[PDB]
Amino acid sequence: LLDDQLKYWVLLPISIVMVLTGVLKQYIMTLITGSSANEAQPRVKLTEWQYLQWAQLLIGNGGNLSSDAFAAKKEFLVKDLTGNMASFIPQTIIMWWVNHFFAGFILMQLPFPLTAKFKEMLQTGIICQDLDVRWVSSISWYFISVLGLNPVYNLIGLNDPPQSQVDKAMHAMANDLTIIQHETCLDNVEQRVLKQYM
Amino acid sequence: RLTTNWNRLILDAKDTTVSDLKFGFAKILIV
Amino acid sequence: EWAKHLLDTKYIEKYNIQNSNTLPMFMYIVFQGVLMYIGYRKLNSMGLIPNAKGDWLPWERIAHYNNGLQWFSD
Amino acid sequence: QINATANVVDNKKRLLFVQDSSALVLGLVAGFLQIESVHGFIWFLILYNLINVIYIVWICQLQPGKFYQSPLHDIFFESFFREITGFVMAWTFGYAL
Amino acid sequence: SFVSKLLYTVSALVLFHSGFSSYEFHHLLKLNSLNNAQGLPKDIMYETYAGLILFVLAVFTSFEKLQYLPIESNDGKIISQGNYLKEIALNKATNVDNLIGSNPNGEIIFTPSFVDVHMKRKICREWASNTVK
Amino acid sequence: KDLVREKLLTIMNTKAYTQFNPEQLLQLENEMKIYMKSGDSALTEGNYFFLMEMLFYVLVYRNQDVDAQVVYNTLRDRLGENSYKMVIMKATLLQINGNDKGAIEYLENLLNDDLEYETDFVTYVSIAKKLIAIKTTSKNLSQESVLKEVVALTDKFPLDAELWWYASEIYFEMGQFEKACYCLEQVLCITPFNYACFGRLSETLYYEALRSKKQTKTELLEKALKNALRSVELSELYLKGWALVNIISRELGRNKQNDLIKLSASKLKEISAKSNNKDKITAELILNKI
């Protein structure tokens, strides 16, 4: 075959619109998500929330290096305590767009041999029945675009309950963290350091 | 190659006549 | 330790009493593999299988019938 | 217990830029060599892995560990379906010339 | 001017010119074939391999051996690690910060809020004394 | 020269200016302004305004201060004055411009307007910090400053490690040296890998041990060893962890620690190598003195 100089008006617009549409998508998604605060509510509830977070981090952070100081905390603890839209919106709409404006062409030649049923779906524009395995219509180039475009976005540069009973649940975890795990540090540090830095 | 192509290197206008001959439309029919 | 080393090299006895708050195993791979089974079985085997005879039509040999004759004619 | 840091977030990400930069110039060279498919795939693999090892040679100073966790895992097979399809984009667009 | 961004531009452009060269030869490979009833890649290939190797080279020099200065001093005293990247082990990563007199904990150590309000008053008085100094 | 911004990136995050000599601080502001005005390339807007206020606060730290008004007026363009920083800049301006206490009461009702949580928790955390910083000038110094911290600290925000760290200083200077150990443990609770709370938590134990009984002397020294060794796992050339290990080993000097003295000496001589600046003077002083 001999396709004639439509490489300007389709292939470039297809890559170009994918580039702009995704860059816009990241800008739009970033715009849509705004917290701008936690809330504007009274003082107390965030205050005891961060107390709860202090307990939570004590589970991870402070529950390792406190062989002497483990028990001293626990008295205190008990007393003190007690996008899919981003997928759907752009790309489905532009499937309609491309089939609307770009149809009924053989746009290019993929380099690789597909199987016949790939050649079933891709050429809905053309109405030949034994054309070839390799040639493809316009919409196939889109089908290759969406899954291959992550390097482009990198290279241009872009990047990514009950109020009281749950307190009792973490008080039960305060009870659990007493002797569920007493971690072996401030005992093996001499062994570990002599094992290393030689 | 550098010299000849740099001389080349130093908008659409949709002209019909070259299109005809490239696709073989321009032909002589001997009857 | 411009000042901490200096404070350590000499002797210091500065302290007093203050209130101070008055503070007091191959299962994982066996498990995961069938999830590779399910897509190939259910959808890629919809119409997209190699090794069945319809995939070699591009590679099918060109039957040679005459190979020494022309049959020019009207 | 080997310590891990948020430092790695940069250098890990940094590596991606090298490979993604090495994955859209590929495809174009394949298309300009005007190639069939399986020749193209083997060409892709040999250039891709030579780029990977020379990256381990030069940017990394022959010390893949001490820069990444699971380093032998990550240089070869991580981000491998993240860029093979980009290579297909590059290869289709190049071979149309 | 260092060679990396130069090499990016010349490598993209030499690939672009190899592109126009291959445009002319390979468009006139099948278009001229139409004149022959559907009837030098080699130096094209050699200049292509030049372009690929040079672009590969181009990417490397955008990565430099990391080189640093001391925070407290005002002389140069340029601190070289002889290293390209930044490592993952927290102990020696903490090293490369401690070559500087800095602490990524930062504010917790220094407590800017209490210190500053006295610091500005006394420091203006203090340097006013040091103005002879 | 883009290498300059690296220090600036440090100086915003580290507040390195805070403990700088006015001689080198004056150098710093001069060295800054040339790159601030000249090297305007390739740096983010957020970094721009963080550098711009850090110019303001250097200038207030400087002995000439009229330029502070310049920088503040140029930086007043964005987000008005409601963010935490412009509350800081206006308070320190109103407090320095005439040496009038006024900003506190204009800030006082602000916290009574924070009763609705009109701003984020970190904001009035910092307001609590800087209003106390004002008040310790109102009440020029006392131990009850910490008692004031308690009504601000144990009631509202344990999470700020800076508060417990600062409280440690006032306990450590003349107060009981044991509650600093608890508070520094709490600092460890907040952040896993503070390796200077590690050195300090051992030093406060050592100073406590200097005034304790013999069995408590050995007990606290042994705990101090294991805390200074806990320093070492977070860093190789950390001058203060290795040094404090070597110090209590100088005090004790017993056979296995004599080997650790040899290892610490190799590491401390590596530290006292000239890769490090000025700190080497303190490191070498203790190395070669005894």
> Do the two chains B and C touch, given a threshold of 8 Å on CB pairs and at least 3 pairs?
no
If residue F204 lies in a helix (H) or strand (E), which one and from where to where?
helix F196-209
Q: Which has the closest alpha carbon to E111: F187, A119, F73?
A: F187
SS3 of E1, please?
Answer: coil
Which residues of chain F does C23 touch, with a Cβ-Cβ cutoff of 8 Å?
179, 182
* A126 neighbors A135 (Cβ within 8 angstroms): no
Instruction: Provide Rg for chain D, Cα atoms.
Output: 15
SS3 of F1, please?
Answer: coil
Token pair for E34: 């139409």
One-letter amino acid for residue A43 of the chain: R
Using alpha carbons only, what angle is made at residue E124 by residues E119 and E130, rounded to the nearest 5 degrees?
A: 115
Q: Which has the closest alpha carbon to F92: F105, F82, F83, F101?
A: F101
The sign one gets for the Cα dihedral E18, E24, E27, E30 is negative
Token pair for A145: 């675009």
Q: Which F residues, 66 through 95, put their C-beta within 8 Å of a C-beta on chain E?
A: 92, 95
* Chain B contact present for A1, CB below 8 A: no
Token pair for C12: 């210091």
**Domains, in order of start, for chain F:** 1-288 (1.25.40.10)
CA–CA dist E56, E65 (Å, integer): 18
What are the residues facing F113 on neighbouring strands? none
Token pair for F50: 């963080």
CA F130 from centre of chain: 15
For residue E21, give the nearest of B1, B22, B24 by CB distance.
Answer: B1
CA–CA dist A81, F267 (Å, integer): 46
SS3 of C53, please?
Answer: helix
Which residues of chain F does A43 touch, with a Cβ-Cβ cutoff of 8 Å?
114-115, 117, 156
Q: Which has the closest alpha carbon to F267: D66, F249, F255?
A: F249
* F197 neighbors F167 (Cβ within 8 angstroms): no
CB-based contacts of A65, cutoff 8 Å, min separation 6: A183, A185, A186, F188, F230
CA–CA dist D57, D52 (Å, integer): 9
Pairs across D and E, CB distance < 8 A: 61
For residue F185, give the nearest of A38, A43, A69 by CB distance.
Answer: A69
Q: Which has the closest alpha carbon to F166: F189, F197, F127?
A: F197
* Residues written for chain E: 133
CA–CA dist F188, A14 (Å, integer): 55
Phi, psi of F57 (to 5 degrees): -75, -30
Mutate to test the interface with D, among E87, E90, E91, E96 (most CBs of D within 10 A): E87
Token pair for F157: 């925000």
CB-based contacts of F83, cutoff 8 Å, min separation 6: F123
What are the residues facing A135 on neighbouring strands? A109
Phi, psi of E18 (to 5 degrees): -60, -35
Q: Crossing angle, helix A43-60 and helix F179-190, to 10 degrees?
A: 90
> Do the two chains A and C touch, given a threshold of 8 Å on CB pairs and at least 3 pairs?
yes
Residue burial B5-31, b: 16+ Cβ < 10 Å; e: rest: eeeeeeeeeeeeeeeeeeeeeeeeeee
Cβ distance C17 to F176 less than 8 Å, yes or no, reads: yes
> Do the two chains C and D touch, given a threshold of 8 Å on CB pairs and at least 3 pairs?
no
Structure letter (DSSP) for residue F19: G
Measured in angstroms, the resolution is 4.3
Phi, psi of F60 (to 5 degrees): -65, -40
CA–CA dist A164, F167 (Å, integer): 32
CA–CA dist F19, F15 (Å, integer): 8
Chain D: residue whose CA lies nearest to E49:
D29
Q: Which has the closest alpha carbon to D26: D69, D97, D96, D86?
A: D86
CA–CA dist E116, E113 (Å, integer): 6
Q: CA D28 → CA A8, A156, E16, distances in Å?
A: 17, 18, 11
DSSP E strand boundaries for E1-133? 66-68, 79-83
Which residues of chain B does A3 touch, with a Cβ-Cβ cutoff of 8 Å?
none
The sign one gets for the Cα dihedral E116, E130, F37, E70 is negative
CA–CA dist E124, F96 (Å, integer): 11
One-letter amino acid for residue E66 of the chain: L
Cβ distance F143 to C18 less than 8 Å, yes or no, reads: yes
Mutate to test the interface with E, among F14, F29, F153 (most CBs of E within 10 A): F14
One-letter amino acid for residue A105 of the chain: F
CB-based contacts of E49, cutoff 8 Å, min separation 6: none
* F202 neighbors F221 (Cβ within 8 angstroms): no
* A42 neighbors F117 (Cβ within 8 angstroms): yes
Token pair for A38: 């936690």
| Dihedral angle computed from the Cα positions of residues F13, F19, F20 and F25, in that order, rounded to the nearest 10 degrees | 60
CA–CA dist C17, E23 (Å, integer): 89
CB-based contacts of E69, cutoff 8 Å, min separation 6: E76, E77, E78, E79, F3, F6, F7
Kindly state the greatest CA–CA separation across chain C.
126
Kindly state the greatest CA–CA separation across chain A.
84
The sign one gets for the Cα dihedral A24, A28, A29, A30 is positive
CA–CA dist A41, F46 (Å, integer): 29
SS3 of F281, please?
Answer: helix
* D56 neighbors E85 (Cβ within 8 angstroms): no
The secondary structure of chain A, three-state, reads CCCCCCCCCCHHHHHHHHHHHHHHHHHHHHHHCCCCCCCCCCHHHHHHHHHHHHHHHHHHCCCCCCCCCHHHHHHHHHHHHCCHHHHHHHHHHHHHHHHHHCCCCCCEECCCCCCHHHHHHCCCCCCCCCCCCCEECHHHHHHHHHHHCHHHHHHHCCCCCCCCHHHHHHHHHHHHCCCCCCCCCCCCHHHHHHCCCC
CA–CA dist A109, A119 (Å, integer): 12
**Could you give the residue ranges of the DSSP H alpha helices within F62-195?**
66-75, 84-97, 103-113, 121-138, 144-153, 161-174, 179-190
CB-based contacts of D51, cutoff 8 Å, min separation 6: D19, D22, E56
The sign one gets for the Cα dihedral A121, A124, A129, A131 is negative
CA–CA dist F138, E117 (Å, integer): 11
